């Protein structure tokens, strides 16, 4: 997370870490939507152009973590994957359309003060909240900046990072890039005139874009960290999987297999 | 499950993380 701050403990009890088995390394972020269901981006598991094809036993999910490195014994839970469900029309070849993936845990995880699921938006919440200029919140242990000298130069957070970024007009989003953006994506960040900065970076993908509803004071996941040409560049934006658009699919997957 | 989106350590404890006010102010103005 670029231009971020450390999260408070429990600030994002639904954040999930995707951990690679060998090499023992961080892959991506994700979110907890149920005691046995985890939501993430499809390019975290499958992206052939960079030779990426991760399968169920290739990784594990660490839920309830605060620190990026420390093994948070007795606070975090480590769960293994029963199955991975990647969207059938996920278009990695073109624009990353439908960049979404569900993951069924083998055994249900037990909620704590540090592990709690997020809500998924209904018809109305999507309409009321996903408007240009409203701000949501993005969290992850991703890099603090695009590039940083190998000496010192920070670069990697010690703990989870959090920013609030404003939803940006679809017409502005389409003019920001030459990638064909779709109904399944929405973009967020500050415009260069706005005199403020922030964005996701490498490692934050798959994590959740959330907004707290002003009506029920609940936290809704409106976006999955999807893609961005760089990190916090001026006149560039981060693009997010528009969760409500693909929610009918999320329902089909869980009503069958869950 | 029905308790989704209500964090054990803030909402349930009537507590506010250091930044959720920016989110609320964006709904009205500044
Ligand atoms: N839709 C297309 O096809 C265009 S591809 C995107 C252009 C190449 N990617 C990148 O420059 C960045 C580098 C680090 N920045 C970030 O992580 C993010 C910034 C803001 C948000 Cl929001 S994420 N990575 C990614 O965006 C993630 C990614 C994208 C594709 C494949 C994979 Cl494997 C991973
Ligand atoms: C990914 O690997 C599995 C092997 O477990 C294989 O069956 C599948 O076809 C691979 N997919 C791609 C896109 O390479
Ligand atoms: Na930007």
mmCIF file with all atom_site columns, N, CA and C in Angstrom, chain A residues 170-208:
data_model
loop_
_atom_site.group_PDB
_atom_site.id
_atom_site.type_symbol
_atom_site.label_atom_id
_atom_site.label_alt_id
_atom_site.label_comp_id
_atom_site.label_asym_id
_atom_site.label_entity_id
_atom_site.label_seq_id
_atom_site.pdbx_PDB_ins_code
_atom_site.Cartn_x
_atom_site.Cartn_y
_atom_site.Cartn_z
_atom_site.occupancy
_atom_site.B_iso_or_equiv
_atom_site.pdbx_formal_charge
_atom_site.auth_seq_id
_atom_site.auth_comp_id
_atom_site.auth_asym_id
_atom_site.auth_atom_id
_atom_site.pdbx_PDB_model_num
ATOM 1   N N  . UNK A 1 170 ? -16.187 6.611  -14.026 1.00 0.00 ? 170 UNK A N  1
ATOM 2   C CA . UNK A 1 170 ? -15.939 5.690  -15.140 1.00 0.00 ? 170 UNK A CA 1
ATOM 3   C C  . UNK A 1 170 ? -15.338 6.372  -16.363 1.00 0.00 ? 170 UNK A C  1
ATOM 4   N N  . UNK A 1 171 ? -15.879 7.487  -16.874 1.00 0.00 ? 171 UNK A N  1
ATOM 5   C CA . UNK A 1 171 ? -15.230 8.134  -18.026 1.00 0.00 ? 171 UNK A CA 1
ATOM 6   C C  . UNK A 1 171 ? -13.782 8.503  -17.771 1.00 0.00 ? 171 UNK A C  1
ATOM 7   N N  . UNK A 1 172 ? -13.460 9.004  -16.575 1.00 0.00 ? 172 UNK A N  1
ATOM 8   C CA . UNK A 1 172 ? -12.068 9.309  -16.264 1.00 0.00 ? 172 UNK A CA 1
ATOM 9   C C  . UNK A 1 172 ? -11.248 8.025  -16.227 1.00 0.00 ? 172 UNK A C  1
ATOM 10  N N  . UNK A 1 173 ? -11.813 6.958  -15.651 1.00 0.00 ? 173 UNK A N  1
ATOM 11  C CA . UNK A 1 173 ? -11.102 5.684  -15.584 1.00 0.00 ? 173 UNK A CA 1
ATOM 12  C C  . UNK A 1 173 ? -10.761 5.172  -16.983 1.00 0.00 ? 173 UNK A C  1
ATOM 13  N N  . UNK A 1 174 ? -11.718 5.238  -17.918 1.00 0.00 ? 174 UNK A N  1
ATOM 14  C CA . UNK A 1 174 ? -11.455 4.736  -19.267 1.00 0.00 ? 174 UNK A CA 1
ATOM 15  C C  . UNK A 1 174 ? -10.418 5.579  -19.997 1.00 0.00 ? 174 UNK A C  1
ATOM 16  N N  . UNK A 1 175 ? -10.333 6.871  -19.687 1.00 0.00 ? 175 UNK A N  1
ATOM 17  C CA . UNK A 1 175 ? -9.346  7.728  -20.326 1.00 0.00 ? 175 UNK A CA 1
ATOM 18  C C  . UNK A 1 175 ? -7.977  7.621  -19.674 1.00 0.00 ? 175 UNK A C  1
ATOM 19  N N  . UNK A 1 176 ? -7.899  7.006  -18.489 1.00 0.00 ? 176 UNK A N  1
ATOM 20  C CA . UNK A 1 176 ? -6.634  6.890  -17.771 1.00 0.00 ? 176 UNK A CA 1
ATOM 21  C C  . UNK A 1 176 ? -5.713  5.854  -18.400 1.00 0.00 ? 176 UNK A C  1
ATOM 22  N N  . UNK A 1 177 ? -6.273  4.885  -19.119 1.00 0.00 ? 177 UNK A N  1
ATOM 23  C CA . UNK A 1 177 ? -5.518  3.747  -19.617 1.00 0.00 ? 177 UNK A CA 1
ATOM 24  C C  . UNK A 1 177 ? -5.936  3.446  -21.049 1.00 0.00 ? 177 UNK A C  1
ATOM 25  N N  . UNK A 1 178 ? -5.121  2.645  -21.734 1.00 0.00 ? 178 UNK A N  1
ATOM 26  C CA . UNK A 1 178 ? -5.515  2.106  -23.028 1.00 0.00 ? 178 UNK A CA 1
ATOM 27  C C  . UNK A 1 178 ? -6.108  0.707  -22.911 1.00 0.00 ? 178 UNK A C  1
ATOM 28  N N  . UNK A 1 179 ? -6.146  0.141  -21.703 1.00 0.00 ? 179 UNK A N  1
ATOM 29  C CA . UNK A 1 179 ? -6.812  -1.136 -21.489 1.00 0.00 ? 179 UNK A CA 1
ATOM 30  C C  . UNK A 1 179 ? -8.318  -0.922 -21.532 1.00 0.00 ? 179 UNK A C  1
ATOM 31  N N  . UNK A 1 180 ? -9.019  -1.803 -22.240 1.00 0.00 ? 180 UNK A N  1
ATOM 32  C CA . UNK A 1 180 ? -10.476 -1.735 -22.326 1.00 0.00 ? 180 UNK A CA 1
ATOM 33  C C  . UNK A 1 180 ? -11.083 -2.099 -20.976 1.00 0.00 ? 180 UNK A C  1
ATOM 34  N N  . UNK A 1 181 ? -11.664 -1.120 -20.276 1.00 0.00 ? 181 UNK A N  1
ATOM 35  C CA . UNK A 1 181 ? -12.254 -1.403 -18.974 1.00 0.00 ? 181 UNK A CA 1
ATOM 36  C C  . UNK A 1 181 ? -13.743 -1.646 -19.165 1.00 0.00 ? 181 UNK A C  1
ATOM 37  N N  . UNK A 1 182 ? -14.318 -2.418 -18.247 1.00 0.00 ? 182 UNK A N  1
ATOM 38  C CA . UNK A 1 182 ? -15.604 -3.078 -18.418 1.00 0.00 ? 182 UNK A CA 1
ATOM 39  C C  . UNK A 1 182 ? -16.492 -2.803 -17.208 1.00 0.00 ? 182 UNK A C  1
ATOM 40  N N  . UNK A 1 183 ? -17.741 -3.283 -17.277 1.00 0.00 ? 183 UNK A N  1
ATOM 41  C CA . UNK A 1 183 ? -18.652 -3.201 -16.136 1.00 0.00 ? 183 UNK A CA 1
ATOM 42  C C  . UNK A 1 183 ? -18.155 -3.982 -14.927 1.00 0.00 ? 183 UNK A C  1
ATOM 43  N N  . UNK A 1 184 ? -17.286 -4.970 -15.130 1.00 0.00 ? 184 UNK A N  1
ATOM 44  C CA . UNK A 1 184 ? -16.803 -5.786 -14.026 1.00 0.00 ? 184 UNK A CA 1
ATOM 45  C C  . UNK A 1 184 ? -15.677 -5.118 -13.249 1.00 0.00 ? 184 UNK A C  1
ATOM 46  N N  . UNK A 1 185 ? -15.188 -3.970 -13.713 1.00 0.00 ? 185 UNK A N  1
ATOM 47  C CA . UNK A 1 185 ? -14.130 -3.221 -13.050 1.00 0.00 ? 185 UNK A CA 1
ATOM 48  C C  . UNK A 1 185 ? -14.613 -1.828 -12.673 1.00 0.00 ? 185 UNK A C  1
ATOM 49  N N  . UNK A 1 186 ? -14.059 -1.312 -11.581 1.00 0.00 ? 186 UNK A N  1
ATOM 50  C CA . UNK A 1 186 ? -14.216 0.079  -11.189 1.00 0.00 ? 186 UNK A CA 1
ATOM 51  C C  . UNK A 1 186 ? -12.876 0.566  -10.653 1.00 0.00 ? 186 UNK A C  1
ATOM 52  N N  . UNK A 1 187 ? -12.670 1.881  -10.706 1.00 0.00 ? 187 UNK A N  1
ATOM 53  C CA . UNK A 1 187 ? -11.366 2.457  -10.413 1.00 0.00 ? 187 UNK A CA 1
ATOM 54  C C  . UNK A 1 187 ? -11.483 3.491  -9.301  1.00 0.00 ? 187 UNK A C  1
ATOM 55  N N  . UNK A 1 188 ? -10.370 3.702  -8.604  1.00 0.00 ? 188 UNK A N  1
ATOM 56  C CA . UNK A 1 188 ? -10.372 4.513  -7.397  1.00 0.00 ? 188 UNK A CA 1
ATOM 57  C C  . UNK A 1 188 ? -8.976  5.058  -7.148  1.00 0.00 ? 188 UNK A C  1
ATOM 58  N N  . UNK A 1 189 ? -8.938  6.232  -6.539  1.00 0.00 ? 189 UNK A N  1
ATOM 59  C CA . UNK A 1 189 ? -7.704  6.943  -6.271  1.00 0.00 ? 189 UNK A CA 1
ATOM 60  C C  . UNK A 1 189 ? -7.948  8.437  -6.345  1.00 0.00 ? 189 UNK A C  1
ATOM 61  N N  . UNK A 1 190 ? -6.870  9.187  -6.177  1.00 0.00 ? 190 UNK A N  1
ATOM 62  C CA . UNK A 1 190 ? -6.954  10.634 -6.277  1.00 0.00 ? 190 UNK A CA 1
ATOM 63  C C  . UNK A 1 190 ? -6.508  11.081 -7.658  1.00 0.00 ? 190 UNK A C  1
ATOM 64  N N  . UNK A 1 191 ? -7.107  12.163 -8.126  1.00 0.00 ? 191 UNK A N  1
ATOM 65  C CA . UNK A 1 191 ? -6.676  12.796 -9.356  1.00 0.00 ? 191 UNK A CA 1
ATOM 66  C C  . UNK A 1 191 ? -5.486  13.705 -9.064  1.00 0.00 ? 191 UNK A C  1
ATOM 67  N N  . UNK A 1 192 ? -4.630  13.960 -10.060 1.00 0.00 ? 192 UNK A N  1
ATOM 68  C CA . UNK A 1 192 ? -3.397  14.714 -9.774  1.00 0.00 ? 192 UNK A CA 1
ATOM 69  C C  . UNK A 1 192 ? -3.657  16.096 -9.211  1.00 0.00 ? 192 UNK A C  1
ATOM 70  N N  . UNK A 1 193 ? -4.758  16.730 -9.606  1.00 0.00 ? 193 UNK A N  1
ATOM 71  C CA . UNK A 1 193 ? -5.139  18.023 -9.057  1.00 0.00 ? 193 UNK A CA 1
ATOM 72  C C  . UNK A 1 193 ? -5.559  17.938 -7.595  1.00 0.00 ? 193 UNK A C  1
ATOM 73  N N  . UNK A 1 194 ? -6.022  16.774 -7.136  1.00 0.00 ? 194 UNK A N  1
ATOM 74  C CA . UNK A 1 194 ? -6.564  16.666 -5.786  1.00 0.00 ? 194 UNK A CA 1
ATOM 75  C C  . UNK A 1 194 ? -5.510  16.835 -4.697  1.00 0.00 ? 194 UNK A C  1
ATOM 76  N N  . UNK A 1 195 ? -4.227  16.876 -5.048  1.00 0.00 ? 195 UNK A N  1
ATOM 77  C CA . UNK A 1 195 ? -3.192  17.143 -4.060  1.00 0.00 ? 195 UNK A CA 1
ATOM 78  C C  . UNK A 1 195 ? -3.109  16.128 -2.941  1.00 0.00 ? 195 UNK A C  1
ATOM 79  N N  . UNK A 1 196 ? -3.447  14.871 -3.216  1.00 0.00 ? 196 UNK A N  1
ATOM 80  C CA . UNK A 1 196 ? -3.346  13.800 -2.236  1.00 0.00 ? 196 UNK A CA 1
ATOM 81  C C  . UNK A 1 196 ? -2.999  12.524 -2.985  1.00 0.00 ? 196 UNK A C  1
ATOM 82  N N  . UNK A 1 197 ? -2.397  11.567 -2.281  1.00 0.00 ? 197 UNK A N  1
ATOM 83  C CA . UNK A 1 197 ? -1.876  10.381 -2.951  1.00 0.00 ? 197 UNK A CA 1
ATOM 84  C C  . UNK A 1 197 ? -2.277  9.115  -2.208  1.00 0.00 ? 197 UNK A C  1
ATOM 85  N N  . UNK A 1 198 ? -2.076  7.993  -2.877  1.00 0.00 ? 198 UNK A N  1
ATOM 86  C CA . UNK A 1 198 ? -2.372  6.680  -2.339  1.00 0.00 ? 198 UNK A CA 1
ATOM 87  C C  . UNK A 1 198 ? -2.757  5.723  -3.447  1.00 0.00 ? 198 UNK A C  1
ATOM 88  N N  . UNK A 1 199 ? -2.446  4.445  -3.227  1.00 0.00 ? 199 UNK A N  1
ATOM 89  C CA . UNK A 1 199 ? -2.737  3.381  -4.183  1.00 0.00 ? 199 UNK A CA 1
ATOM 90  C C  . UNK A 1 199 ? -2.285  2.057  -3.583  1.00 0.00 ? 199 UNK A C  1
ATOM 91  N N  . UNK A 1 200 ? -2.769  0.968  -4.172  1.00 0.00 ? 200 UNK A N  1
ATOM 92  C CA . UNK A 1 200 ? -2.240  -0.353 -3.877  1.00 0.00 ? 200 UNK A CA 1
ATOM 93  C C  . UNK A 1 200 ? -0.953  -0.584 -4.669  1.00 0.00 ? 200 UNK A C  1
ATOM 94  N N  . UNK A 1 201 ? -0.217  -1.628 -4.298  1.00 0.00 ? 201 UNK A N  1
ATOM 95  C CA . UNK A 1 201 ? 1.039   -1.943 -4.970  1.00 0.00 ? 201 UNK A CA 1
ATOM 96  C C  . UNK A 1 201 ? 1.214   -3.460 -4.991  1.00 0.00 ? 201 UNK A C  1
ATOM 97  N N  . UNK A 1 202 ? 2.413   -3.909 -5.367  1.00 0.00 ? 202 UNK A N  1
ATOM 98  C CA . UNK A 1 202 ? 2.670   -5.337 -5.519  1.00 0.00 ? 202 UNK A CA 1
ATOM 99  C C  . UNK A 1 202 ? 2.468   -6.085 -4.208  1.00 0.00 ? 202 UNK A C  1
ATOM 100 N N  . UNK A 1 203 ? 1.607   -7.100 -4.243  1.00 0.00 ? 203 UNK A N  1
ATOM 101 C CA . UNK A 1 203 ? 1.266   -7.892 -3.087  1.00 0.00 ? 203 UNK A CA 1
ATOM 102 C C  . UNK A 1 203 ? -0.109  -7.603 -2.538  1.00 0.00 ? 203 UNK A C  1
ATOM 103 N N  . UNK A 1 204 ? -0.696  -6.456 -2.889  1.00 0.00 ? 204 UNK A N  1
ATOM 104 C CA . UNK A 1 204 ? -2.014  -6.077 -2.393  1.00 0.00 ? 204 UNK A CA 1
ATOM 105 C C  . UNK A 1 204 ? -3.157  -6.673 -3.192  1.00 0.00 ? 204 UNK A C  1
ATOM 106 N N  . UNK A 1 205 ? -2.874  -7.199 -4.383  1.00 0.00 ? 205 UNK A N  1
ATOM 107 C CA . UNK A 1 205 ? -3.914  -7.759 -5.232  1.00 0.00 ? 205 UNK A CA 1
ATOM 108 C C  . UNK A 1 205 ? -4.665  -8.867 -4.508  1.00 0.00 ? 205 UNK A C  1
ATOM 109 N N  . UNK A 1 206 ? -5.947  -9.010 -4.845  1.00 0.00 ? 206 UNK A N  1
ATOM 110 C CA . UNK A 1 206 ? -6.811  -9.958 -4.183  1.00 0.00 ? 206 UNK A CA 1
ATOM 111 C C  . UNK A 1 206 ? -7.395  -9.482 -2.873  1.00 0.00 ? 206 UNK A C  1
ATOM 112 N N  . UNK A 1 207 ? -6.805  -8.462 -2.248  1.00 0.00 ? 207 UNK A N  1
ATOM 113 C CA . UNK A 1 207 ? -7.322  -7.906 -1.019  1.00 0.00 ? 207 UNK A CA 1
ATOM 114 C C  . UNK A 1 207 ? -8.595  -7.113 -1.240  1.00 0.00 ? 207 UNK A C  1
ATOM 115 N N  . UNK A 1 208 ? -9.226  -6.663 -0.150  1.00 0.00 ? 208 UNK A N  1
ATOM 116 C CA . UNK A 1 208 ? -10.563 -6.067 -0.272  1.00 0.00 ? 208 UNK A CA 1
ATOM 117 C C  . UNK A 1 208 ? -10.620 -4.543 -0.260  1.00 0.00 ? 208 UNK A C  1
#
